[PDB]
């Protein structure tokens, strides 16, 4: 299911850059355990920049 999540992030990564905005990631995380606030907090703990290496985020924060 984190495996699936990574696939979903990849589906919305239109240019296959490995990056998504925090916003994009929150929108997707809503459509799929964490509270809305936990998603915000997790993404902010991971990085202060708006563009997020979603694979690394999943590895560090979710796995």
């Amino acid at each position, epitope marked *: 299911n984190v495996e699936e999540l990574i696939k979903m992030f990849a589906h919305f990564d239109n240019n296959s850059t490995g990056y998504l905005t925090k916003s994009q990631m929150k929108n997707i995380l809503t459509t799929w*355990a*964490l*509270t809305d*606030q*936990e998603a915000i*907090d*997790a993404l902010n*703990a*991971f990085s202060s920049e708006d563009n997020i290496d979603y694979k690394l985020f999943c590895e*560090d*924060i*979710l*796995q």
Partner: nanobody
Amino acid sequence: QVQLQESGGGTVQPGGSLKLSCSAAPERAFSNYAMGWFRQAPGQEREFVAGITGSGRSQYYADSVKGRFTISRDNAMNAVYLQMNSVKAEDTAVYYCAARVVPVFSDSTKGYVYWGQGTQVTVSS
């Protein structure tokens, strides 16, 4: 989220025992959140001490504390504990409890989202 507050800090003799508590106020049931203890000695980086899965069923330790420190949690009381036995000089530090947003274990500060306040443990004769 999880609000986290440690207690039980203070002074302990070399070779002695002390137990730290960390109370958690989680938005979801506490068993969803893996917990860890970290410590930061004076002017040093914060380091992993011990971790426990959401359910409490698996516990993990830093090599330097294995066989001396014990981590446990009581999900019915929203608490996590660190029993420190056979304490040594190396153990003097500010101790922090920390929560992940998933129930599986991590040994890295990068795996943790929520942090406590910090409590001083001093090993002194």
